Amino acid sequence: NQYDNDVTVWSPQGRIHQIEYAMEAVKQGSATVGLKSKTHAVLVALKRAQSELAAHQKKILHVDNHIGISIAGLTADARLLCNFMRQECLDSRFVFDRPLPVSRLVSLIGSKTQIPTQRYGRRPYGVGLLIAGYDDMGPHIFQTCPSANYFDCRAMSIGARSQSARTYLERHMSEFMECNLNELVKHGLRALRETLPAEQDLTTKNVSIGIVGKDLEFTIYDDDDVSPFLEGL
Amino acid sequence: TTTLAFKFRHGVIVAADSRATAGAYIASQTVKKVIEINPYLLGTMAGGAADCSFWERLLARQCRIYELRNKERISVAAASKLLANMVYQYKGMGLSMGTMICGWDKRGPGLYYVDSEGNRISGATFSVGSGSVYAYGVMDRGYSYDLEVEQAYDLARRAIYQATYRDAYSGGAVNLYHVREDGWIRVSSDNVADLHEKYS
Amino acid sequence: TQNPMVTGTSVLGVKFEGGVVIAADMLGSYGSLARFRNISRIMRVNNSTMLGASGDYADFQYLKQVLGQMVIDEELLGDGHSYSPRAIHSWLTRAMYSRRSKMNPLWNTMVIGGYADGESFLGYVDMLGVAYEAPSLATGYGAYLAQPLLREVLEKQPVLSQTEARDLVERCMRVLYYRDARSYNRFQIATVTEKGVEIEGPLSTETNWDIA
Amino acid sequence: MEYLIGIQGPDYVLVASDRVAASNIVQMKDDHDKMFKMSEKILLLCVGEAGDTVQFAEYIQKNVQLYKMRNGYELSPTAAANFTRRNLADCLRSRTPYHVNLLLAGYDEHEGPALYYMDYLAALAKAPFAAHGYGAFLTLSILDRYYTPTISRERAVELLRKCLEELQKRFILNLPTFSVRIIDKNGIHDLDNISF
Amino acid sequence: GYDLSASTFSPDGRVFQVEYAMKAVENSSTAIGIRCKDGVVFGVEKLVLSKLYEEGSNKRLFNVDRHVGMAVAGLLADARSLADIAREEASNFRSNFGYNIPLKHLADRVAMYVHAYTLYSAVRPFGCSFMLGSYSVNDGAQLYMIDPSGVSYGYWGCAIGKARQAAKTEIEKLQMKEMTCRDIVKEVAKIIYIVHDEVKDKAFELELSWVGELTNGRHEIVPKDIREEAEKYAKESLK
Amino acid sequence: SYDRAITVFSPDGHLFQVEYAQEAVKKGSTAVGVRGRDIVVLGVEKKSVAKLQDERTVRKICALDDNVCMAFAGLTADARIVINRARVECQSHRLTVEDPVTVEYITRYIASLKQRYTQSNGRRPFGISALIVGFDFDGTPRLYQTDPSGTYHAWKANAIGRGAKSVREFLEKNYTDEAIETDDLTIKLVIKALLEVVQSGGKNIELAVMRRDQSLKILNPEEIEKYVAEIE
Amino acid sequence: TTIMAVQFDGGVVLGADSRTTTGSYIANRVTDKLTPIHDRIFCCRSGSAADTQAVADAVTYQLGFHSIELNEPPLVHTAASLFKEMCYRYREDLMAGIIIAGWDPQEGGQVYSVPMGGMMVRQSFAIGGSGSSYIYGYVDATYREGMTKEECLQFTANALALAMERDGSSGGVIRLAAIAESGVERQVLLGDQIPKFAVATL
Amino acid sequence: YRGVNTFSPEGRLFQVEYAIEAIKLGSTAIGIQTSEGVCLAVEKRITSPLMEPSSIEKIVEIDAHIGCAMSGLIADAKTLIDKARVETQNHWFTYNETMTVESVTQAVSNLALQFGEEDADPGAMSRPFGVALLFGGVDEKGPQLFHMDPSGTFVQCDARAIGSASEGAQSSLQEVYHKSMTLKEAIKSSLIILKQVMEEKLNATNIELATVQPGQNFHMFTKEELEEVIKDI
Amino acid sequence: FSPYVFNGGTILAIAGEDFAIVASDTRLSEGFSIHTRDSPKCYKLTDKTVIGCSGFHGDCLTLTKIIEARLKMYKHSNNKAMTTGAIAAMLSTILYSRRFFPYYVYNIIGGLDEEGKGAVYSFDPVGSYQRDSFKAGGSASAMLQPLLDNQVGFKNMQNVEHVPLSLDRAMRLVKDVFISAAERDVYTGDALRICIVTKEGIREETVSLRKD
Numbered sequence A: 001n002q003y004d005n006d007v008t009v010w011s012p013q014g015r016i017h018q019i020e021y022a023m024e025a026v027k028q029g030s031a032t033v034g035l036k037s038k039t040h041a042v043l044v045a046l047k048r049a050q051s052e053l054a055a056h057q058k059k060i061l062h063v064d065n066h067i068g069i070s071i072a073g074l075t076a077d078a079r080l081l082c083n084f085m086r087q088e089c090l091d092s093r094f095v096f097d098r099p100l101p102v103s104r105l106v107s108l109i110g111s112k113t114q115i116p117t118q119r120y121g122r123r124p125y126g127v128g129l130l131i132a133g134y135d136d137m138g139p140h141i142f143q144t145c146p147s148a149n150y151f152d153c154r155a156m157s158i159g160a161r162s163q164s165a166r167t168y169l170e171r172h173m174s175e176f177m178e179c180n181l182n183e184l185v186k187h188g189l190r191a192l193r194e195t196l197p198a199e200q201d202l203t204t205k206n207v208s209i210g211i212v213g214k215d216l217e218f219t220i221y222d223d224d225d226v227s228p229f230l231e232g233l
Numbered sequence B: 001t002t003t004l005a006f007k008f009r010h011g012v013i014v015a016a017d018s019r020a021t022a023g024a025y026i027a028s029q030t031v032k033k034v035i036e037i038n039p040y041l042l043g044t045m046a047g048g049a050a051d052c053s054f055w056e057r058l059l060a061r062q063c064r065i066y067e068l069r070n071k072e073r074i075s076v077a078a079a080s081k082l083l084a085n086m087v088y089q090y091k092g093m094g095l096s097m098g099t100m101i102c103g104w105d106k107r108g109p110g111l112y113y114v115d116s117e118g119n120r121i122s123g124a125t126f127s128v129g130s131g132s133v134y135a136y137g138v139m140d141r142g143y144s145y146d147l148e149v150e151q152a153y154d155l156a157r158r159a160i161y162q163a164t165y166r167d168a169y170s171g172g173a174v175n176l177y178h179v180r181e182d183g184w185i186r187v188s189s190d191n192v193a194d195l196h197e198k199y200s
Numbered sequence C: 001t002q003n004p005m006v007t008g009t010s011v012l013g014v015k016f017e018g019g020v021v022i023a024a025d026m027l028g029s030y031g032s033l034a035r036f037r038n039i040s041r042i043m044r045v046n047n048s049t050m051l052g053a054s055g056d057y058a059d060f061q062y063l064k065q066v067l068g069q070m071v072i073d074e075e076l077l078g079d080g081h082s083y084s085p086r087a088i089h090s091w092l093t094r095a096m097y098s099r100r101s102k103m104n105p106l107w108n109t110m111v112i113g114g115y116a117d118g119e120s121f122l123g124y125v126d127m128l129g130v131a132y133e134a135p136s137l138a139t140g141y142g143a144y145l146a147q148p149l150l151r152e153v154l155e156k157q158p159v160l161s162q163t164e165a166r167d168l169v170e171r172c173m174r175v176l177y178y179r180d181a182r183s184y185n186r187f188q189i190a191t192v193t194e195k196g197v198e199i200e201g202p203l204s205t206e207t208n209w210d211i212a
Numbered sequence D: 001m002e003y004l005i006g007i008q009g010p011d012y013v014l015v016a017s018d019r020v021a022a023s024n025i026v027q028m029k030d031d032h033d034k035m036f037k038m039s040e041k042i043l044l045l046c047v048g049e050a051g052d053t054v055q056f057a058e059y060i061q062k063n064v065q066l067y068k069m070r071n072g073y074e075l076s077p078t079a080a081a082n083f084t085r086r087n088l089a090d091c092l093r094s095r096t097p098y099h100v101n102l103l104l105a106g107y108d109e110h111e112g113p114a115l116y117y118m119d120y121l122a123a124l125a126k127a128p129f130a131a132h133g134y135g136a137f138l139t140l141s142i143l144d145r146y147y148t149p150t151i152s153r154e155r156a157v158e159l160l161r162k163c164l165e166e167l168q169k170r171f172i173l174n175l176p177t178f179s180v181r182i183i184d185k186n187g188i189h190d191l192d193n194i195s196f
Numbered sequence E: 001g002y003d004l005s006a007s008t009f010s011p012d013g014r015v016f017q018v019e020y021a022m023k024a025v026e027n028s029s030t031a032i033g034i035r036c037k038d039g040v041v042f043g044v045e046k047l048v049l050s051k052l053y054e055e056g057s058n059k060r061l062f063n064v065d066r067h068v069g070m071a072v073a074g075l076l077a078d079a080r081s082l083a084d085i086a087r088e089e090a091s092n093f094r095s096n097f098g099y100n101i102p103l104k105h106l107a108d109r110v111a112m113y114v115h116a117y118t119l120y121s122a123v124r125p126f127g128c129s130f131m132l133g134s135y136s137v138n139d140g141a142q143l144y145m146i147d148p149s150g151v152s153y154g155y156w157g158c159a160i161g162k163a164r165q166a167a168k169t170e171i172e173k174l175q176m177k178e179m180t181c182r183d184i185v186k187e188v189a190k191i192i193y194i195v196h197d198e199v200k201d202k203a204f205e206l207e208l209s210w211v212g213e214l215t216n217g218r219h220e221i222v223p224k225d226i227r228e229e230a231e232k233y234a235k236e237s238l239k
Numbered sequence F: 001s002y003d004r005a006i007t008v009f010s011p012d013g014h015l016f017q018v019e020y021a022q023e024a025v026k027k028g029s030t031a032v033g034v035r036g037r038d039i040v041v042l043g044v045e046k047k048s049v050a051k052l053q054d055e056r057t058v059r060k061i062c063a064l065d066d067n068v069c070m071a072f073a074g075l076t077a078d079a080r081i082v083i084n085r086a087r088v089e090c091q092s093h094r095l096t097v098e099d100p101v102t103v104e105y106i107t108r109y110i111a112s113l114k115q116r117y118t119q120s121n122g123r124r125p126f127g128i129s130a131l132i133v134g135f136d137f138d139g140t141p142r143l144y145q146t147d148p149s150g151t152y153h154a155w156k157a158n159a160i161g162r163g164a165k166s167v168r169e170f171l172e173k174n175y176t177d178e179a180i181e182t183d184d185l186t187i188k189l190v191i192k193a194l195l196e197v198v199q200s201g202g203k204n205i206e207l208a209v210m211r212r213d214q215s216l217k218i219l220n221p222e223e224i225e226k227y228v229a230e231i232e
Numbered sequence G: 001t002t003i004m005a006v007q008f009d010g011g012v013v014l015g016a017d018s019r020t021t022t023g024s025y026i027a028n029r030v031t032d033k034l035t036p037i038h039d040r041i042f043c044c045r046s047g048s049a050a051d052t053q054a055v056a057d058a059v060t061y062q063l064g065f066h067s068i069e070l071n072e073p074p075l076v077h078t079a080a081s082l083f084k085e086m087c088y089r090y091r092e093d094l095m096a097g098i099i100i101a102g103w104d105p106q107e108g109g110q111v112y113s114v115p116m117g118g119m120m121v122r123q124s125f126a127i128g129g130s131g132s133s134y135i136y137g138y139v140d141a142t143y144r145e146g147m148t149k150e151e152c153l154q155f156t157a158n159a160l161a162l163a164m165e166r167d168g169s170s171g172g173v174i175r176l177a178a179i180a181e182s183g184v185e186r187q188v189l190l191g192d193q194i195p196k197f198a199v200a201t202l
Numbered sequence H: 001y002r003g004v005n006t007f008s009p010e011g012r013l014f015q016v017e018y019a020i021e022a023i024k025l026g027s028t029a030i031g032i033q034t035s036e037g038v039c040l041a042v043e044k045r046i047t048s049p050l051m052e053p054s055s056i057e058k059i060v061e062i063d064a065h066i067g068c069a070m071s072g073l074i075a076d077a078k079t080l081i082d083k084a085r086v087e088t089q090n091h092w093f094t095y096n097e098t099m100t101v102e103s104v105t106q107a108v109s110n111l112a113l114q115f116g117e118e119d120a121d122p123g124a125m126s127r128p129f130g131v132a133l134l135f136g137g138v139d140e141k142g143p144q145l146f147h148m149d150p151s152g153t154f155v156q157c158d159a160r161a162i163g164s165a166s167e168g169a170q171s172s173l174q175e176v177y178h179k180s181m182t183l184k185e186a187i188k189s190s191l192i193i194l195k196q197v198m199e200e201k202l203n204a205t206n207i208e209l210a211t212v213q214p215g216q217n218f219h220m221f222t223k224e225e226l227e228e229v230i231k232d233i
Numbered sequence I: 001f002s003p004y005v006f007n008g009g010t011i012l013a014i015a016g017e018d019f020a021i022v023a024s025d026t027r028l029s030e031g032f033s034i035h036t037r038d039s040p041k042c043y044k045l046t047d048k049t050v051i052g053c054s055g056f057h058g059d060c061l062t063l064t065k066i067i068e069a070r071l072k073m074y075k076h077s078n079n080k081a082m083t084t085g086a087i088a089a090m091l092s093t094i095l096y097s098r099r100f101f102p103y104y105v106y107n108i109i110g111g112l113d114e115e116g117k118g119a120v121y122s123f124d125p126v127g128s129y130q131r132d133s134f135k136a137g138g139s140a141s142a143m144l145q146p147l148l149d150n151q152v153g154f155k156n157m158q159n160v161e162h163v164p165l166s167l168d169r170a171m172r173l174v175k176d177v178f179i180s181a182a183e184r185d186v187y188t189g190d191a192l193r194i195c196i197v198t199k200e201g202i203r204e205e206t207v208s209l210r211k212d
């Protein structure tokens, strides 16, 4: 019980326990799904409220006109990362007058998130991200971890009870490329529904959707704005 | 420009013109040269338009913070000292700013003159601007601590009007303010052209 | 650079149907002295961008080193994204403006030509951060001598062919040699099209009538 | 320019100063006060560039009062004068010099009355009498002619009047009113203003 | 408690923190690199953790410079950080001296940077091993490998990861000193398939890169057609 | 620069370094303060004269300004540092605001300083509690208390230091408008409260009195003995 | 000051005058203006004596450490690059014009010019200094491609002699140095050894 | 041992968990949001009769349209309140507008959790703030009530109770609160619950009540108003 | 080395009951030469706000980019778009931040206020700003202003009804003032770009002026 108190301490098995715990934080978070087609990248998140009289915590944030994120973990760390991403996107537009490519933005995140995991007194970022964006290379979906590692995905889910969602995405992965925007969103909602604990249904109060496309700047749908998508499932 | 303020029995009267020039060109004739720092505090602007507007606004923010922290309105002396200290850091760097701080504090009506050159003094009557010399003559001859409210309004309007008549860089409308125990009130805004007809 | 030492003269540029062409002589003048007569003042920024520069040559070499390094770094990623002529033009404007603001300017006037997405680009950047895009450009004395000829033709005919643009550039280069005291007879022509960037060898203004 | 004058007697210090605050050929104030109360027995008379005088004098005043509050006793006039010179000299070569001319007057129980002279270069001198400003040129000779070490305070005020009358008759600037104060073993006493 | 920091020697003179870092490198999938006459070839056994990952995700082959490649094993996050350091070292060299950094010099600079992280308690050792390869006409093909401890050596054929020992045995029979890159690519693919364990790991994707005369001295990914031929050859060999 | 987190939370949400600082205040000598109608009185119990110490240099009652004074209970060295910081702030407030400080303002300043030391890096909490009394410019008497935690409150009458619970209990029952009716009656209330804990009385207690316009005044031993005699 | 460097097949030839002046006074009349940066790498200095000496010393330190680290002989281009980097960065503080000439296995004899401002350029032959302005026509008229080492030595000697004759800031003796794979051969032409051209008399 | 930036096996920062535990030691505070306005109530919890209740300021005004209620380590909240006031005035100075309640809560929450030990600052905060804040105000969106915790997480809530009696105060708020509730009903309901949870008998001197309405500014009830409401209550 | 150069340009803004017009010429020049003839000084900021910047083009581009960045920062933080008044207040602070190295730029913001009515804000180089009903700035500011005061302001005219300004009358007035200015001001007169802000959106029109 002496190798799990610092991030600069390797364990005998060649594992850093502090990083493992940070990965365990995002697991306690709430579920969120992200998928892409030939034209669009979609983020659907399940928001939960601490109390019945409290508003559901927001999970999808703006980064730029072509990039958005879904968070799962420590919100304070999420805002710190979101702030960093926005500045990087702004700097690219200011210097090159051009949107920052999604992959290059993700690489910057990994570099920033890696530094804390190697210095004494620092801690990993306790937040996972699902980055959805559109660039000259087409739609993109990325996944980030408290360990400074990222994966270019075609459909991913993170958060509590997200394995049931990942099971659905793998089963129907073959259809996402050639489906329309309405069909693609419904696929994201159906997966999120699987994560839900049986006696509970998707509602306009707990579902938030984020869409980015070829000719569609990143937009967030919440509250009654989600009703058109839910109608049909 | 011509700004003017004096203390009398029923508070302090503040008056100014509304002209801003860029060299010999009349940039505007509707400039508000009196800043409502607080419902009980006023500030006048003379010199650089940008310098005056920025530093008065900075003073207004500082005064508001002071009230929130201390749960009591800042005094006129403290507000003028705040402005004097803020602008003294940039002494000799080219700031042009001549201000009068007018209000009603716990000690009573107050009138302080603060200049970017570092001057900070209090007095019964003050006049700042290019036309200040002209407004001093009219104000000095007609001023009395026992003036009636209506008389004080007329003296302030006349002093500004005469200054606009003799000073090329002063003109527009005469904005008049009156600070009382329960706060300041916007008395009137009379155009110089209309005043010229009334006085002649 | 507070005071330039070795400087290049005017640089020309004009865009045609499907590309852009830039010209500049190979001469570094050390204040009324044709000191270095075989220096190329045109650079291949990348596969779809080329850059000519006037003013201090050392500052031009510095920008060559910096800009060349960035292009290398972008190619290392291999993610399918490459700097466009507009992106390079934007980067140069910021670099020039920032140096001017710090009061340590890069004493240069640069012309950026490129061709991407089936669209031609031609941009200008001064040492003070002034930038814009025009159908034709001419820095230095080219603004007084060569620009009137290019503008007159382009107003008559908005769209030119590659051959017409090349002939127009050669005529302007001839005029500059006649009337510019800091010009040289050997010059280069760089062209960017869908096939990339090609730089022509040390051409000479052979057509030089001297009927006195 | 402003005017300061100080006369030191056997057991008192008499100081006076004009009460004019001008701004480009206009008297903005006619009752300006140029004397700062360092302590119960020390007065600082400061003239010079606008802003510099108030900033310096107030800064010294805060320190001198702080010394009294921290140690339980007030600074001596000599220590206060040397403290002022140290601060002025230190700032002399900095990026923010203070252009102020100072007269420090005080009374100590043991040493007695003391008058100190200091220019903007921070050169400190102890003199029986001193004056600052352009008026010093016209009044210093009067003091030299009529001053004696054993001058009574009644005679000192008369001698001060002769100096101020000379300013009215021969000086070019308009200095109608003068603040007057005296320091002795009982503290600082404010006398009637000398007016014309 | 002698193994809790990199700034303490064990009683017998061992830095356990460094040793544990190597242990982490020993849990990754194998990655091999073979030097030949023409140039250098790299190969990596990329396991597909989930079918939801895009092909090419978490690529373990990098181009630190236009003429230098890089293969890595172990913690991927640390590897990417070292790749950024190598790029910085290569770029700084060109700006200061005006020509491409020699591979030996680049390996030395990165190795010292790695070694600086095994001396203090304020940081931890990089938990990753990587290999640098390049080819120049003047210097020829060159291949290097660096471990967590910061040790760098030249190799004729190197392995790192889980099946390091099995890969080393296979590499011993290639006789690479008189072979070309075209033939070596097929051999690299064959070895990876043999060492891989299909019973334990579900599936993997083969990533290949090379640098040599055929590429004109620029490190680049092997063309898709060549990779397909190599994969077919390796699968056919596994009768 | 030493930058370790001296003060941190603990299970059940406690700042042991703050609590330990409080038990350090409790070991100090008792101090009492009462707010009268036109007078504020501060009292303190002397552990032992020793017959050799110079009493001038061991005063536990200090004047922050002309209108404010305070008495502490805890580490003597820590109090001297806090007192000096308040004294410079009082002069600074005079310089800028051009008016004398108010008791609430200086109490807020001292409390914020103490709170900062409980949340700063590489620092130990101040081990003192202070009783600040004075008169605002309006003339209303004020009495405040500050703890090491950085909290402060306004008190009609309070006691800090050793045996403060009993003195506070005595004050609660014995504080009334009649008791503070006269200045002499207010002084006797402080003396009687102190006598609840200290044994000898008269020779083991120091008293300081602040009036509206007059500055701080320290009662002489003869005056203290006379009040003690009148009490009995 | 007159500094000249020429390139021939398999090496380079360097030459310079030997005059250093403070106004119109010749402080040193035998100054050596050819500073060996390394083995088979030389630099001819012109401009400010203090700046050139400081810059030459710094580059010598940098190149020596660089060569030791790489365990290979330095490249002439690398030596020029180090001169360019410092001369360009401190262009506002340095008054120094340099020409770097030497031999390396990779590229053979090379001549690089680093004039005031910090630009670098490879040249078949280079000249610099105050006296170089008087021989621009001569070197352009009398230069040929494919000259041998002996011809280059004579060509450099003639050019320097003419410049020293005309320029007032040049004079003294001519110091030459031929650099090839074999080594460095230095020589000094003084007195009657200096090439002589008859002065027209009417 | 156990640095401040340490992760528990369940991914929950030890320091944040302890700071949240410290909130339960504070006095109860209630805030209700209604279309007519927002009301804040807090138990003063007078310790001894000799203490002056006027000196306990558990409700403070950030700006003319923003009010804050505090619970926990009251000394910690002083810096958070000062930051909120400064941020509000900076926004007016720059944009000549009034910051929204959410933006003020966001700025304060960002300040929270910015604590560290190594390579942070010469005197950075060594521990999280042990205070939970209730921000009430009226913005362009109307009445707004926001709750901020030590973890830097903030969320809008229709009605929220914090303090030693948060569990049970929230229970009562659940039964009584409804969307169409008026401001008068909200004040009455808040007082009724406070009287229930408080150990001491409720009177006009041991509680603090403030309201913010679209028309009027931040208003703290005086004794005369407090006596009027409790009489009916 | 002077870090400033004047590039000419004229800008104008007129506020109406339900509209706001911002117009400017499209000539960029330096000294006696013309850089380009298609460089408008109008910049769209939001769906109901337009800014016109003229002066030193280097500072014009930087300021516009800074403003564009700041608007996005505000939207992200406050979750709502800026207002015309908020932009004006911010621009004053941005301009004054460089008081001792000012932006040599003249700005005029035109747009709709929160109530839906037109609003025009004029600026000085160092941030001094003030709301107005109509304003002209740039090279031909002195030429444009007097007629706007006479016609829009009805100043010095007696026995004239003060009819509210219509969009059509404003558009004709804008064209006429610029046509007159082009005849007398060298720095303006290549083309006229008109931006019309209304409830529906921002509309753009271009009108030719005399090339020289």
Ligand SMILES: CC(C)C[C@@H](C=O)NC(=O)[C@H](CC(C)C)NC(=O)[C@H](CC(C)C)NC(=O)OCc1ccccc1
Pocket: B001, B019, B020, B021, B022, B023, B027, B028, B031, B032, B033, B045, B046, B047, B048, B049, B050, B052, B096, B169, I102, I124, I125, I126, I128
């Ligand atoms: C609001 C008042 C300050 C208006 C008025 C009163 O004095 N100001 C003025 O008359 C002064 C000139 C001089 C008399 C100081 N004018 C100004 O300050 C005008 C105001 C604009 C509306 C054009 N602007 C101006 O002169 O700016 C030029 C400038 C450019 C860069 C730095 C500093 C100053």
Ligand SMILES: CC(C)C[C@@H](C=O)NC(=O)[C@H](CC(C)C)NC(=O)[C@H](CC(C)C)NC(=O)OCc1ccccc1
Pocket: G001, G019, G020, G021, G022, G023, G027, G028, G031, G033, G045, G046, G047, G048, G049, G050, G052, G169
């Ligand atoms: C050493 C050569 C490479 C440089 C040499 C050749 O012309 N330079 C010079 O002679 C220049 C000439 C000019 C700048 C006045 N002189 C110089 O650099 C300085 C004068 C300084 C005030 C700048 N001359 C001087 O005092 O030289 C002293 C000296 C004497 C012998 C060797 C080295 C240096």
